[PDB]
Amino acid sequence: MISDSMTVEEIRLHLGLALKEKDFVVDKTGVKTIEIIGASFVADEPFIFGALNDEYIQRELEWYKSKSLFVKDIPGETPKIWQQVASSKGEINSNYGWAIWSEDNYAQYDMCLAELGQNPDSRRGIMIYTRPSMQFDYNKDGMSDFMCTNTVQYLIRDKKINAVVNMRSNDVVFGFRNDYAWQKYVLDKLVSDLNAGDSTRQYKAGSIIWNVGSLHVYSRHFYLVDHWWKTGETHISKKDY
């Protein structure tokens, strides 16, 4: 059986509680955050707070498909968030397409697909994003990019493929929205590829279970949590706030 987990609605409540109680933690950039430690919830909505920017997510998807470790290869103007984290040569670590499709990271997608194709009940169907050398690689050439996704495990039960996403660190506003879109994309892809392999499989996408070491909101987004706390609206304009 799948575990009885929190939903995104309950996560919102706990974040609102944390803000109400001034449970602040200082970020490495010196700014305040509110935070849930050891968060586990079913990602039953594609965002927690904020607006869905489908245009941005598609540009990040294209970049992941390219497997490029260089931020300039993001289609169009590279977001400053990626710029400020990049090395002196414009290089990063956290291209998730590189993580699951590159032979340099040992063919995570293909091997997980082969494992589940051979044994649908397997507990070894997993895509390993991070690596032990990340202890030294995170600041190569002056980048600041310690892989925040650790592993994603895929478990086929009752003809549904469930994804257990294990993250070290996840920004509630920008991070979760983008990362969810990515994990949903890969899950749908894996379902497709397994079904294409054998027409009698008839697998369906199941639940995405989100496990985060530190799930946090930065102080620049406190107004979103606050507004939701007062009104139940998951988004405002900064100007309307």
Ligand X SMILES: Nc1ccn([C@H]2C[C@H](O)[C@@H](COP(=O)(O)O)O2)c(=O)n1
Residues with a known catalytic role: 148
Question: Could you say which of its own copies, ligand X, none residue 179 binds, taking C-beta under 5 to 8 angstroms by partner kind?
Answer: ligand X
Characterize the bridge pairing of strands 126-128 and 32-42: unpaired
* Helix pair angle (222-231, 8-20), 10° resolution: 110
**Other CB atoms closer than 10 Å to residue 5's CB: what's the count?**
15
CB of 208 to its own copies, least distance (A): 10
Question: Could you say which of its own copies, ligand X, none residue 94 binds, taking C-beta under 5 to 8 angstroms by partner kind?
Answer: ligand X
Question: Is residue 93 a contact point for ligand X (CB under 6 A)?
Answer: no
Tokens of 86: 């990049």
Question: Is residue 124 a contact point for ligand X (CB under 6 A)?
Answer: yes
Tell how far CA 68 is from the center of its chain. 18
Segment lying near ligand X (by CB under 6 A), choices 14-22, 111-119, 164-172, 225-233: 164-172
CB nearer its own copies, residue 5 or residue 53:
5
Question: Could you say which of ligand X, its own copies, none residue 141 binds, taking C-beta under 5 to 8 angstroms by partner kind?
Answer: its own copies
For ligand X, the binding residues in 179-198 under the rule CB under 6 A are 179
CB of 33 to its own copies, least distance (A): 9
Tokens of 184: 């949903």
Tokens of 36: 């849930």
Question: Could you say which of ligand X, its own copies, none residue 195 binds, taking C-beta under 5 to 8 angstroms by partner kind?
Answer: none
* Helix pair angle (174-197, 54-66), 10° resolution: 60
Question: Is residue 97 a contact point for ligand X (CB under 6 A)?
Answer: no
Cα angle 24-30-34, degrees, rounded to a multiple of 5: 20
User: How far apart, in whole angstroms, are the C-alpha atoms of residue 110 and residue 118?
Assistant: 12
Binding residues (CB under 6 A) for ligand X: these are 28, 94, 123-124, 146, 148, 169-171, 175, 179
